[PDB]
Structure formats: structure tokens, C-alpha cells
Design a protein around this ligand. Sequence first.
Ligand SMILES: [Mg+2]
Ligand SMILES: [Mg+2]
Ligand SMILES: [Mg+2]
Ligand SMILES: [Mg+2]
Ligand SMILES: [Mg+2]
Lengths: 129, 164, 52, 209, 143
Amino acid sequence: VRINVLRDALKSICNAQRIGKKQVIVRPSSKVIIEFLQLMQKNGYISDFAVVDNHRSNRIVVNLIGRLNKAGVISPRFDIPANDIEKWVVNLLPSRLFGHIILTTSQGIMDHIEAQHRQIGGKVIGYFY
Amino acid sequence: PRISRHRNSSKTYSTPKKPFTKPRLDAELKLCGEYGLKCKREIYRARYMLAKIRRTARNLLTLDENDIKRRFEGAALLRRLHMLGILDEEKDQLDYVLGLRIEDIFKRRLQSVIVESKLAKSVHHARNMIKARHISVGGQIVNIPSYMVRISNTSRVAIADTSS
Amino acid sequence: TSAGKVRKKEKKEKPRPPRGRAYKRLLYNKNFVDDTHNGRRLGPNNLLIRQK
Amino acid sequence: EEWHPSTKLGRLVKAGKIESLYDIFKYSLPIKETEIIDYFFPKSELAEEVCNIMSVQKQTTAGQRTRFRAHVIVGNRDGFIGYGAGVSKEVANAIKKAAKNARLNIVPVRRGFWGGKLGDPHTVSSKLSGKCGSVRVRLIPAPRGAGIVASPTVAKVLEFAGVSDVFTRQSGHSRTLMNSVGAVYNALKSSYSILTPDLWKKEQLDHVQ
Amino acid sequence: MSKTSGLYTARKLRTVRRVNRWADKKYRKAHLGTWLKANPLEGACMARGIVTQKIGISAKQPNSAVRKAVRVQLTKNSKKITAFVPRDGSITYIDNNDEVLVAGFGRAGRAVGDIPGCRFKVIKVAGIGLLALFLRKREKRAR
RNA sequence: CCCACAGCCCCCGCCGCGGAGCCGAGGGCAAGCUGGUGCCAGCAGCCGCGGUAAUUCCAGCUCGGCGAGCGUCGCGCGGCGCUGCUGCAGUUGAAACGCCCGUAGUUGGCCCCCCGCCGCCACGAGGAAACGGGAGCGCUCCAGGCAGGCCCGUUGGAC
RNA sequence: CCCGCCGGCCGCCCAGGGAAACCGGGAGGCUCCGGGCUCUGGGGGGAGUAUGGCCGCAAGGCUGAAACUUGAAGGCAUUG
Ligand SMILES: [Mg+2]
Ligand SMILES: [Mg+2]
Ligand SMILES: [Mg+2]
Ligand SMILES: [Mg+2]
Ligand SMILES: [Mg+2]
């Protein structure tokens, strides 16, 4: 059965971008998907997207512009301490200069840079670069 | 029990993981001849100290600039390095430390400082003179070749008054 | 059938070398200053022939 | 006698019309003449090394037919590296063929920083991976002063490429030298084909070259 | 996936590893206990025994040689082993009914070289190292 | 001088013992010349050598490594992504139960703007040191120790 | 008749993957290595043997070692 909606969305996005497509459709919508996409948009990877209402299982449309090279999720939400972020950054990211790691906190969904700025920790959602 | 049980102790050097390596042997012999080292334990000691400094610098650099621990530890480390003359005075950033190298450690040895002062003909001559106790630092006789001189004592190194 | 069937020249007397740091001096000079054509090796026949 | 060009690119090189190799690399032009590179390296700045020499036999009606296979790498220690192979009945001719092939194929190598930016790049731009046969290689940027943490064979390639700090990992049957060297070569080749946010700048195409 | 990966699955992973790490020959040989009860030296560097027979053993097929060895009985176990004295002409220094010290070969408990079914080495006889007797550093005029 | 008494270190005078071994030289693995023996004697962690040049045995010459230390045996960590959470494998190399139902167990789509509870993150209190980390101090250096300077944070032993 | 949709059974195949043979309605999207659950394996022999237990009229099935021994055994492919 379906479980991780975000994983399916990200796999579809990467698949489409691989063959240089321009638009994608991901079937189930969710708040977490929306925040993930908003962060991606603010960082400049996926431009604009739209949410289509149908009362059940809202669909989404996203517009691509290359740029993105990889995206993923970490299924079991591990609890990163505030001072334990560097190890995950080194393990997961190609370099310590341009990748982004997403965390969910009591202060909301933000990036690892922002969490380091506020010296707080939380749970990990995913990554993109 | 005896109080001698609470005395601490530790090693001071490391041996390479792959011993028979031609370029390493060549470089080590080259350095030994240049600075007239006795055996290869001195190079291992220098490498150990360099590794300690580099690890401290790495750990500090991983943190944010405005971290209180970072400021404290970096200030202490820079002060020690400057006082010892290993790092140039004009450098006051933690990044510069990672570029340091064992030759900088060697250049602050007593043999080296008395050779660059034209007080000895050669490193070997410097060692022979040091053993015979013809040299002094700040009016005190020092007979340890590996003794390291601080910058403030560089101009205070001279020949022993009582030596013949 | 007898073990030790396989088991005489005298030892040549030559001056002892300078031990300690001095040994490092001559090794440095042996292969960084003093000469050791046809590239170079460590004690092949040709090199030993010249010294003899 | 004298180098007579056999290609349009070769004739252009004979003339002083094109001045840098990076111009050729920017348009992905194949290189077929060994003179097209030595012209840009007149002082023989390119190094040379024979990585391995192996003998290969072919069974026949009367005994075996032996032959030699050689692998050669070349670099100037400034973002250039090449790799080639050659097979011949004689060792010397195989070495010559391998050197020629290595000279022919060459790639630029991108270099970057670990954290603090201090003048000259000292390590790879980011993480790179390669694959040849069963062998896999990972190249991870390292801090300044960390040296080259790698096996003797891979270290020589990284030196000839002009790198100073790097962490490496190998997987598979790494005792097969050619596949290891090929994996590292492919990883280095991939470097200038990875997009980064610094290169997002949109530039208009130009009618030059 | 193939492996369980849920957030509340530590017990299953621990049990899986506990069961499956018994399949390694080395781990079994070390942590099972049979080898210790079967090894005549009971996890000791070397043992002391009495030689009772001097014998020669042929080598394997691709080699051709008769190796010199002795039969020993360990004082603290009373069991029997075969120990081999390697150094040339060192059999003549070993005499029947003599006190010996016997150690192991390089490999823990496997045969070494072309010598079949031999796992022990003679190092001291009558209190003097065999390596020292072979170099003439000392003499066995006490026996 | 020190010491409960004596040594020892250190200081002052007269005479003044300058001594390097252990392993190896086919590969892994840095380092080659005569004489013997002849698949015998022996070497060899593995590959292998020895049936008339033995580059591998036994000797001499020479050479290399570490060095007042060197080598051998057993155990533990590493090597090992060959126990795999990070991070193995499962067509053919070792390995998907003959198939279905099914309880414990594990895992479970989307949605409510704020209330309570559990986990979670951060901070804090409270609770032995020694060890470890670490600030400062020239036991002649060092392994160490918490000292110490005169015109000392209330000199210090912070955390 | 031809133009589609759902479901099923098949063939060839670009990318990609792989030690390769080949797969491609995945053996793809994975060292750039994290969707969920279950089972099995850890060099070759000894050995699916011994000894216990359960089931079965029996033949036998499920479960299942150690000592000891050994330096290769195996896979896909190339030339003869
Ligand atoms: Mg395996
Ligand atoms: Mg089969
Ligand atoms: Mg099988
Ligand atoms: Mg995996
Ligand atoms: Mg087995």
C-alpha cells in the first residue's frame, strides 16, 4: 500500500527532470509536500507549482528548469541534536557549500543552515542539491 | 597503595602504517641530513605535535565564529603558536594553522637558532657544542639539543659566560 | 644420511665505521653528493668492479 | 620531416589562430594529432609514468603467441590528466603506443575548496565517483594539509592531476590496476560536467569558434 | 526493504545479529569453547613436556624430504603431540627423555608448509634455546 | 647539598676506559659475488627454492631496516562494506518456505491553527574525585607536577 | 471496419543496469548507496552425518553439531 507520499513525489520529479521534461503531476497532496516545494522554490530549483482541488486526493503541477541533481527522503525520522548536524552534512551532501538538508522542528520546517543559526535541533525530513 | 601508582605517563610519537615506502624514506633521510637528526623518533614526535594542533584547529573551525568556545580556544591556540614562533605574527586567523608543517617546528630548535645567528659552523657542530655546555639561554646553561626557543628569548641566546 | 654434512675463510680486518649521527652523514653524502651512466643502482657488478 | 597537419583543427593549430587548449575543450572537439597538444606544451611540461606491464597469451596450434599490454598516464600538475593503453609484440613499441594514446585523450580537472577560500584551489570541487569493471572510487574533499589518503597507484594519478588534499575510498577488486585507473579517470572526467549553483548564470551563446 | 527499518524495531535487529554472527568460522572458533577444550595448550603461549620418541616425517607430493620431529607428552595434560625441530642439525642436540619447551607455528592451529599434521615447534631444550645452541652462543655440556 | 641514618640527583676541586646489536637481501617488501652440497641436508607466515650458476639452503664480501634495543609465540582491535544501523548478498557463484488462511509482532492514505496527555528539541537544577579534554605556569627540555613571583585577581589551581 | 479505455498473456527494444550471459510489464529509478513486512546465506569437505526431540503403521519427514581435514572449490565469457 501507499505510505510515503513525499518519496513518490520526489522520485517522479527526478524521473521527469532526467529526460528534460517541463511539467510533472504528483497525485496526492499534503502540507509537508507543499512546504518542501516552497523551500525548493525559494532556493531556486523548481520555479512555480499549482495545487488542484478535487475534494479527495488533491493533485499538484510543478514546472521544472533543470538545476536539480538529486532529491530524497529519510524514512525513519531521526532526532538530530543541534550539535550533531555536521556529521550528517558530511555523510549526505557532496560539499559543505551548496547542499540543503530539511528538518522539522517546533519552530517549523527549515534548513540546516537556519537551524545552526538558531542553535536548535529536531527531526530530519530529506535533502536536495 | 604506593603514591607512585597515581603518576601519569604517555607516549609521544607515532609510527607509519606502511613502513617501506621509498619517497617517505628519501624525504626522512633528507630532513635528517638537513637538520642533523639522531634517529627517526624525532620526526615522529614532530608529526604527533602537528597532528594535535591540526585536530584542534579543525574542531574549532567546524563551529561558528561567534561561538564562545571557538573564541576562547582559538585565542589560546594562536597565542601559544605566536609565542612559540611557529606561526608568523601577522597571521591571526585559524585557517592559517592548517597550512603549517613540521619544518616550521624544526626551525625553532636550539641548533637552528644558533646556526642562523652564525654562532655555529654547522648543525653537527652546534650539537657537539651544546653537549659540552658552552651555550646558555637567558643566562642559564641549556644542554638539550631539542630545546625549543621562544621568540622573546631569541636575542637572549648567547655563549655561556663560564665556558672556555 | 648424516645431518650436518653441509654444516673456511678468515674475516677481513677493516676500520670500523662512524656510528651514531655520523652514519647518517655518510649515507646522505653517499647518494646525495658523492657519485654512485646507465642510470644507477646499489652495488651492482659494474660499480663494484671500478672500486676494486 | 615537419609536422604537416592532416585536419582542419590541425591546420588552425599550425597557425596561431587558436591560443589555448581550453578553447578546444569548450567545444568538445576530438583530437587526433599528437602535435596539437605538444604545441601547447613546448617545454615537455607533461610528465610520464608506466603504471603496469602485463603479458597476454593466445593459444595456437603450435604453442602460444605472447604479447604485452601497457598503461601510461601523463599530466602537468595543473588541472590536466590523461590515460592510455597500448598493445604490441615488443615492450618498447607497446609503451610508445600507450604514451601516444594517453597524450591524445586528456581532460581538464576542476578543483575547489574545503570551507575557507584561500587563493588557489587545493582539492576537488565536490564528491566524485567512477566505475570501471567491478571497481568503484569515491573522492571526497579534504582540508588543507590533509595530504592524499589513497593507495600508491591512485595517489600518483591525483598528483599528476595537480591535487594536494583528498580522501579516497575504493570498492571491488582493486588489485586489477587498469580498472582502478579507469575508474579514477572517469571520476575526474565527470568533474566539469556537474552543475553547481555558481554556474546557474544564464549567458547568451556567442558566434566565436 | 529486505531489512526491517521501522523506528521501533531494535529488538528484532539485535536478535537477528545475535543469531547470524554464529555463522563465521572465526567467531565460532573463538567464542564457542570447543577449540579451547580441544587445544592441548589451553590458550597458552607455549607448554612444557617430555620427549619420548625421535621420528622423521616425509613431506608432501610436490616436495621430497624427511623432516625431523619428536613425540612429546605434556606435563599438565598427559596427552600426546608431535613437535618439529626445524634448525639444521639440531636433532643431535635433542636426546630421548629430555625436558623441552614447545610453542606454536605462525598459524593458530593449522598445519604449516609441506609438513603434514604438525602444529608445534621446539624452542628450548634442557633450559637453553635451540636458536642459541645452533649459533654456538652456548653449549650443552650439562647433558 | 640532601637524607630519621645513608645513598641518588645537583654544585665545587685533582686525575680522566669513547664500547651496537637484532633481523633480512626472489615477490608481497627497502636492500647482489665467490665456494660448497646436489629434491639429500635444509629454507619457506603465502606463492614457492633445492634432481650441477641454487639471485631463496650452508659460509665469506657487500648492502638495507630499526636502533639500546631487535626478533619469535598466543590473545584483543584494525585490516573487513568477510556480520553490513550508517553499510553486504539472495536468476546462473552460498542462499526466496510448494501454495493459501492466520494470531502475537511490525507497519499503516488525506483532512481541523492554537485545549490536555506521550514521545521529541533547547535550557536549567541536583549529584565524588581520579582518568579524558582543556586555561596559566621554562621541573635546564621531556615523560610530568600544580606550582610560583615579588611591587602578585583576596597570586593561582578556571571550565 | 478503426479510434480509444480497463484488465490479462506474450515478442523486440532506446536509455539505464550488470562480472558477463542478459533484464528492460525490471535483474531500472542505488557507493549520488533509507517506501513497508517476512524468510534464507557467510571458503570447500566431514555432513543433512552422530546424538537428542516431535510427527508417522512403516518407508521416512521437520529440527540439526563437533573433532578432524584442505588451498582452492565455483560463475560468465576468450583462443585452441
Ligand atoms: Mg560475501
Ligand atoms: Mg549449480
Ligand atoms: Mg546457487
Ligand atoms: Mg543498499
Ligand atoms: Mg562453509
